[PDB]
Design a protein around this ligand. Structure first.
Ligand SMILES: *[C@@H]1O[C@H](CO)[C@@H](O[C@@H]2O[C@H](CO)[C@H](O[C@@H]3O[C@H](CO)[C@@H](O)[C@H](O)[C@@H]3O)[C@H](O)[C@H]2NC(C)=O)[C@H](O)[C@H]1NC(C)=O
Ligand SMILES: *[C@@H]1O[C@H](CO)[C@@H](O)[C@H](O)[C@H]1NC(C)=O
Lengths: 399, 399, 399, 399, 399
């Protein structure tokens, strides 16, 4: 029986007089240089209404003290050892974009070496407010800024450095949960110096993460209802307006766009500066089919069984030949005296009815020619609108 | 051998018989004059249904006690030193408007000086109540209350002061996230007094904060749908009511306006005094399309193939010389005796049918003139209300 | 060097052997009385589906112990002193209607006096269940119950009293947050006693809070939509049913009334005893428009070109000659054989068509007369129901 | 000066050498007997989508101690004494159905007797997972298992016993919050000895709580729109299909059932066993009005100006002579040669129009007889199905 | 007298100089192996949008100690003993894929043996992020991962092993709550060796849990409404398009299917991969009723009183007789001269009307033949799509 019980001789030796209130150095003029390694793991939820961001990052620590040194000689060759966190000095590195306390797993153990180098592997999910931008909403990048800093100390007590090469944290192809909502290309760290006056300067440092959304599910959620609405009203332009159900088709598909516009408004607020640049594509298409049903009401107004004023020849000998010669399909197009008064009144009434019928035939013929030319012009206009859509999307296939 | 271990000697010297429970003074009659300072950082969310405000500010504290003092000589000339917070005296400054406990990240270290001055850097989230005004809804100036006061001690024990000039916190345009939803005009602190009875007076000192909404999301949300509904029904009056699908147009758009009034009800609540002035614009425009539906149902009632009483000349020859020529165009308009009874029996029915046709022509002509004049009057009324609305709205845009 | 550092001498004197677990008295047969002070500060959230009430109360405590007495004179005229709460005896008073732990900020300081009285200002959030009855839906009053009691103590251990006069807490119109949803008329404290058996008797005292909903924020959207639906269908009765768009207006507003019932159903439920009987007005209004479209289908069935027989004479003579005078001004409704046979064959067909036209004229004339009759009857019923509704609203303009 | 300050001498005699970690027995072969009393307060929310149940329990814990016995006489006759809970032995009575830790107000005090028993009046809220059944939807009864057990101890350590008779638990006339969603029938406790291994036997026992719904909101709320849809299409079968708006009425109420069916899609869940039987009664009456719009499209297909010939004799003797008679009222019904060539085409065209008019009269007469007989058969069918649903709800409602 | 109180002597013996900070062996070079025993209890919530998994598991631990040993001799042969968890060594191993810390029930008691092994029965409610797939939406398998790992320690101190056979945890069908949203098939554990560099390795161990959906709720919520509104339009193809209500019927249930396609984006998949397999059967169905609307407007455009010429015989003798012969049965279709001259214009007008009527008869005859042939072709296409759908669905249902 000798005086070698276990490896708890170190906890008997240097865990009796050491406390956590005082800063473990000898000369107070030399700062405690700390190092930061950031391995991002996953993001959870983006938000622009409350301007808040939720993420989950791994967190490494590297500092060096002076009260926790002993020799590897005659302590049974021990080098590293676990020690609880509530008995050593703990710094206060935190971002200054807090909105709430993030619930983090509480690990109780940290490292210590024989020369004074410690390790602190602990996880934390930080909730944060950051800058947002939606000026190109399906093709977006977010220049967000995380700022590790000391909330209460200065340059002279804690200096934040980085432990490894900045290329190794810029080229971080490490463990990241894919198949989510977003991607990242690279992570850009930067050291920064910030003073506010003489002899009160704090140790800030900046991060620049950039986040990139997949334009895949939002395409199948938003884009194609516009394109089959365009297919169905291009195919539904073709009914003749002499019945009256064409304006019924117009009011029912504008009611369809109305309920679709109620259901699509709950995508992004962008209440501050952000203009819905994708909403311009909606509103110019809505303007063109608004003037389409305006000319629908116009051509229903012109073509009707009215028995009114005769059509003018100036738009009959000039306007008709201008719209037929350029289009492909045009076509060409006493007792015996009482018997005479009766049949004369009968033939006068019948020729008046036949004249009104031929005038109404002329009205519907002019309306049909106008409908055909407007069919050609409107298909040319929607094909120009489709190629205007395509000529903006054709750049970003390679980017 | 020098006996000097570290700067731990000062902490082990003064933390021997010090307790955090007692209020640290030498004379108990002199009040501990404390000083506070406000660094506003962020606002989070509003709710006018529950009358609650959620924000996030940075916060500072200042006091001077008479037990945290020693000589700055012969201790390696140290001036400031970190100390834990749960071993010294902590005040209880709080607001009188708590509805919930905001989760706040603690800072386990505070400063001390050689003459007894301290420093307390800690943030804490403010979930508070605020009397909100909803009379002028899009152009709203608000006025909340953040009463930083004590909870037990009076003026004779704890007196609160400021730290810097009130102009420097009135023009506080420090670190503050932009691109949110509200700006601030100024922050106005003022020191007051409030005693409920004799020998009891607390330290009340308000912080009047003023926020202002950005009227940009509500415009693109619900202002222009009204104006293209206006261009739709203005260009959609123009179909003739002789068919009957104009009634279908009118029922479909008041169904659309009704369902858009349905969905917008559970979007923006306002329950302080009642309905805002924005609902005046809703009630006048629904009155406009109600009287529009009244006139359409009136002109469908007047113009119909009815075979009823002849049109009166007192509204025929009068209205052609009162409205038409003054506003519209001048578009004014046994072999014989037993055999010839069949022609009489035919011509009686023919002249009856022709007379009913000419009377129905007169009915539709009077209806066309009334439709034209009411269309012109309604367009003038809409233009007058539009120029009135823009000449009452164009003031707030020019500062 | 006198033997007085500070007032820490008392804080080390009577905190040397004072325990925190035993109830501080001299004899165990003497109950210690406590006091009750309740300030109805503000409400947070009401609910009837989960049956939970959430509010915040400024609350005070008062009791008297016998171990904390010392003389003021010879201890430098000290009367009051702050002391931590985790070193003294704390009672366990709490209501027995909790559903959740309300987050409340802790208060680490209480008073102490030299005669032995203490003073505890301790707020706590009330999230709790209560008896709610919302039978009278717009004009309601709730007799909710709060039951202050000890959890395990008896009358023989402690006792519950009230501090000031009960009139001063009954008329306690203190600091109260207005401009929300619920007012505060009065509260009613009442001391009771609930002894369940012999030698196990508990001490309780009640609070019957009286709160009243504002009939302004929901009354708008639950009253005037029905009002302009009434003005819409009253102005929409005007068209004749001969065109076929009156049934279109009828199906359109029944679809609007149905989707209005869809949006209004999920507002406030009542599942056990209380009924939605403010919707008895809703069920009589839907009975009104159901019988309205029923007589619409009836008059479309009676009036149509269906080619039926001559109508009933006795119901025609009493309607056209009598009932019209009741309701309005009445309205006063080989050559001999081979030649004439063709004229007679044309004449029989023409006179058959003319007789069918005159019979159909009689059909829609009787239809118009009956339309005017039940139109006047239904407008009399609508004005009677409207004056009944406004006088039943006018009962409650008393207090 | 007598040697008694207060009754603190017993606490000084007990709490000097008593550790809370050891199990308070004199021999390890004697298990401790505990007692269970359950008085349930109220249940809050049911959700079978997550299969979760939330309730609040007033429960008691009675166990027996062997280290805290002393004599009452010569210690001033004191019997019942308060003691904190964090200084004595606390068991681990938990259930094996926790999915979320319920927030509970901790009672810091318990009693102690001089015979050797203590009691703990401790609450905790339960967030439990239960097996739910939604087969019989309105009059449902559920069967949940609150299996009280020890999570780590065995029969050789503890033993779960009862305190009073289980008939007084089954006859629980105590405090229960009425006016909610559910109600109580009975509470049935049951002991169940359960072992899993050799010499590894735990202490289980069962609770089978019984709850019953009061169908006063959901029943009438999903009963009213179906029944006025029934009265609406009963009173709306009666308009004639000759106009063309009867199919507009039918598409209107099928769109109404579309929006009512999609608003009822967000209701109580399924897939525990399958769909409830309340959807079978929905889908069969939807199938019968599918047959109703099928016969509308049948009677519109048959009755139309299609320009065909006379119908087959065997079909018109069965439709206009059989079903119009034996089921209802019998609704019976040089120049002389030049003019010889004239008028022949006129009389041929007039007799062609006359025979087409008479054939079309036969068409809509057969259609009217079919409409009348289908009206009779459809009223009999909906009356039979309605009285069947009424009697199958009426016998099943009784007990 | 024997001064042996109880079994508290062994607790006072081994809990005298034992510390929970240092690791509990004598030779530090031997890693203490730990064992893992997992039985999953129930899952709570799945979320493909934020990619998070929520479940509740039962959990066990086993390790070997050298400082908590004693002898069974002369201590009343005691083996089972309770000891608090906050006074012994606790490992730090946890899941590498946490997001949020869930509230877990606290079990402060653990067993201890005399040889040096202990029990640890603690539960935990974990919140993890796992890989999901949304390709096969009704019948999916989820190869998830629950990686147990050491967050802070290496191989040289701890070592994660198993406890029982992997077949007994592979066929683990113990106490589990059925009748939920999912159901599990098997749990596949696997040992894993991870060496990131030289002399720094971690002890990971994998869990490949397998869960499978029962398509009962989403089937009855999704697939049969498509079935019966396709029943509605295949029974609604019956009417001829001459009335003008066939287009209105078609666009009405087109709007119904469109708003049901709007509302089906509530429980749809997320941005993980892209379009699900169920979206193909929806887009081909909307293509079917869009081309149905296209042939509807085509047959309305062809058959209308447009006042055009006779149809061309190039497509009349061949195409119209094709579907009449190779398909079912067809239908085989003194002024002497100045007095009688007032009939030529009359007979010309009547024969012109008769010729236009016969041409329009030819128009709707060709339209009726085209309607019948397209009815046959479309029912053949619907039956082919239905037999393709059931021969694709019959494979996965049989399994
Ligand atoms: C440990 O728990 C036991 C049950 O939770 C508790 O009850 C005891 O149960 C046994 C088994 O039934 C008894 O049985 C009696 O057996 C008779 C036949 O010999 C029969 O006629 C009776 O009806 C009973 O079933 C015990 O009598 C019963 N104990 C009591 C007090 O009722 C044990 O008591 C409990 N042990 C301890 C030490 O608390
Ligand atoms: C609940 O389940 C238990 C299972 O043992 C059974 O004994 C009991 O009868 C059930 N309750 C009812 C009301 O059927």
């Amino acid at each position: 029986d000798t005086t070698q019980p276990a490896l708890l001789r170190l906890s008997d030796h240097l865990l009796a007089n050491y406390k956590k209130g005082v800063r473990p150095v000898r000369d107070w003029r030399k700062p405690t240089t700390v190092s930061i390694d950031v391995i991002m793991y996953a993001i959870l939820n983006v938000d622009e209404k409350n301007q808040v961001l939720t993420t989950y990052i791994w967190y490494r620590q590297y500092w060096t003290d002076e009260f926790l040194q002993w020799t590897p000689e005659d302590f049974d060759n021990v080098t590293k050892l676990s020690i609880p966190t509530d008995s050593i000095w703990v710094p206060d590195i935190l971002i200054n974009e807090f909105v709430d306390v993030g619930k983090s797993p509480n690990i109780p153990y940290v490292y210590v070496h024989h020369r004074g180098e410690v390790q602190n592997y602990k996880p934390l999910q930080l909730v944060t407010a950051c800058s947002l931008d939606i000026y190109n909403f399906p093709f977006d990048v977010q220049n967000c800024s995380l700022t590790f800093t000391s909330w209460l100390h200065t340059i002279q007590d804690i200096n934040i450095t980085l432990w490894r090469s900045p290329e190794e944290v810029r080229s971080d192809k490490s463990i990241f949960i894919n198949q989510g909502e977003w991607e990242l290309l690279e992570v850009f760290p930067q050291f920064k110096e910030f003073s506010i006056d003489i002899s009160n300067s704090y140790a800030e440092m900046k991060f620049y993460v950039i986040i990139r959304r997949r334009p895949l599910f939002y395409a199948v959620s938003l884009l194609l209802p516009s394109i089959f609405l365009m297919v169905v009203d291009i195919v539904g332009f073709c009914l003749p307006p002499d019945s009256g159900e064409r304006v019924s088709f117009k009011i029912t598909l504008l009611l369809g766009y109305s309920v679709f516009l109620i259901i699509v408004s709950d995508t992004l607020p962008a209440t501050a500066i952000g203009t819905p640049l994708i909403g311009v594509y909606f509103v110019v298409c809505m303007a063109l089919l608004v003037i389409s049903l305006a000319e629908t009401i116009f051509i229903v107004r012109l073509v009707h069984k009215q028995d009114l004023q005769r059509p003018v020849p100036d738009w009959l000998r000039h306007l008709v030949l201008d719209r037929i010669a350029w289009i492909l399909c045009l076509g060409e197009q006493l007792a015996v005296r009482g018997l005479l008064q009766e049949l004369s009144s009968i033939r006068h009434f019948l020729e008046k009815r036949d004249e009104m019928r031929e005038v109404a035939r002329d009205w519907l013929r002019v309306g049909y020619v106008l409908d055909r030319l407007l069919f050609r012009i409107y298909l040319l206009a929607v094909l120009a609108y489709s190629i205007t859509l395509v000529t903006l999307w054709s750049i970003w296939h390679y980017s």
